[PDB]
């Protein structure tokens, strides 16, 4: 079940960690952190994810944001991740990503970051 | 205030419809909808937002995911928009979007679509 | 034709200028300039577009880069243009980019922009 | 010199085969082809590149752009890649991609792929 394979943490490959739970109606909730993992570097995570029968190994689609404020940083900046789950003994999930920094009319050109990431359930090094 | 702002309804170059409320703890909540507006077409979405201090007419930085399931349609998919919001009598969020599939690993590698959508309080046409 | 309604000048929003010849085994060449049209604001463009027979209205797919370097600038940054045109009285041609700038390995996962731009044969304002 | 490890072959992790000459004033010329390396899959590609004197390892950015036309194939689609390379015994080309399909106007919201992919100088598998 996709629910059962997508609830836990995962790590990219600087070993960022995503704490999530998927909820029965589509949530995700959790935390995204950094690999030494203090609250220092945890922020709040929500987004959705989309079951859909099983079929050709296809993956599920989902999506999260993180805004970068906690009470010790406020970057005036959200990513979004948008990916699939694929499950199995090397469960993956491969994302692309969005950052936005909250910018001026004049650099709003300059305002959006893109790049990618990809986690999986064993933590690297 | 930023939170103030935000809450409420927008509308892209297309009359799609984004309600949302903005939560005092950066949670953004709502349905995403189209222009005719059944619920045929309606769908939860989830995100966040970074509120900072007010400083040289920067924008509020913000994410949020729709996943393509409803009662009437999965489509196997989730959108993630990341943008900013900037106030005022001529308000708007402007965003770059990101559309994931579920596909095979083979078809993986053309999964995902980008593109870009602002969003106004006045509904067009 | 493909070749014929591409060749000529362009203008985005904000002015900033396109000038390109299509060649006739699918080459584009030109400059990228922006609006006051001084050689300090000229750059050299090179790209492809691919000509396909004339159904359903669809567009012609193209893209191109600039390296920002010329003799009076060394931005150590490039933009690539992904999109297609579209013919006609109102001829349009709709992009999105990606801009890297020369990094660190430590930084580089900050090195790419993205963003969207929408050529005229009309320069605006 | 940036010109010097340039120019060459270069493969991404499926083994597709990029061959490239850097020119002096900044062009980038070449063939883009898929591993098995038959002239069915060989596309021209042209780009650009921006050499800056080298400080802090900072990458060369640059880009380039394929038309998927040849005398065996017209996909009605073009790629653009937007990168840096970084030399060195493990030399590599870092991107981002945008494909752009020809559509309908109706069809242009779903007309763009974005994707990554990293280049190195040794044959995979």
């Given at each position: 079940?996709?629910?059962?394979?997508?609830?836990?943490?995962?790590?990219?490959?600087?070993?960022?960690?995503?704490?999530?739970?998927?909820?029965?109606?589509?949530?995700?909730?959790?935390?995204?952190?950094?690999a030494?993992?203090?609250?220092?570097?945890?922020?709040?995570?929500?987004?959705?994810?989309?079951?859909?029968?099983?079929?050709?190994?296809?993956?599920?689609?989902?999506?999260?944001?993180?805004?970068w404020?906690?009470?010790?940083?406020?970057?005036?900046?959200?990513?979004?991740?948008?990916?699939?789950?694929?499950?199995?003994?090397?469960?993956?999930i491969?994302?692309?990503?969005?950052?936005?920094?909250?910018?001026?009319?004049?650099?709003?050109?300059?305002?959006?970051?893109?790049?990618?990431?990809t986690?999986?359930?064993?933590?690297?090094?």
């Open positions: 079940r996709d629910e059962a394979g997508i609830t836990g943490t995962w790590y990219n490959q600087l070993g960022s960690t995503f704490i999530v739970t998927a909820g029965a109606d589509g949530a995700l909730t959790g935390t995204y952190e950094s030494v993992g203090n609250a220092e570097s945890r922020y709040v995570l929500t987004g959705r994810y989309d079951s859909a029968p099983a079929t050709d190994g296809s993956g599920t689609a989902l999506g999260w944001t993180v805004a404020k906690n009470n010790y940083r406020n970057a005036h900046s959200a990513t979004t991740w948008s990916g699939q789950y694929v499950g199995g003994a090397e469960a993956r491969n994302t692309q990503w969005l950052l936005t920094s909250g910018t001026t009319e004049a650099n709003a050109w300059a305002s959006t970051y893109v790049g990618h990431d986690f999986t359930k064993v933590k690297p090094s």
